[PDB]
């Protein structure tokens, strides 16, 4: 199993037990999830996205203008990480990131916003939307903002 973690915050984001597809010419990953129902805890049944509940992702809120401010700083920070670790990626990342930001802002009303369990404001903001079938959730992550953890057995909850 591969655990995908936030390059900035080191929080767990998802694992390769889900269907993962690359979009935006390798800039983003779309991770397909399922709605699940669990008891929480007079107790109540809660329903949510398995990606969110399994990895303890935390919902947050943005105005469109606040997200614009956040995402320009985030893409600058990933640029710096690439200059340190993967210099060959910097130029195509800048190009793709600017266009993907345009896409996200144009489709802004169609996303919910999630961050890692420790809620670092400099970490990645994952985007939740639903497929046309109106039942399947999926989440968008920035591929260059992830690090991979190998885990053959007995995955540990850590950051």
Author numbering: 1 to 41, 63 to 180
What did the authors write?
Histamine-Releasing Factor (HRF), also referred to as Translationally Controlled Tumour Protein (TCTP), p21, p23 and fortilin, is ubiquitously expressed in eukaryotes, and involved in apoptosis, cell cycle progression, cell proliferation and cancer (Bommer and Thiele, 2004, Nagano-Ito and Ichikawa, 2012, Bommer, 2012). In addition to its diverse range of intracellular roles, HRF is also able to activate mast cells and basophils, with the release of histamine, implicating a role in allergic disease.
This particular packing arrangement is very different to that of mHRF, and has not been observed in any other HRF crystal structure. One hHRF structure, and the mHRF structure, contain non-covalent HRF interactions, but reveal different packing arrangements.
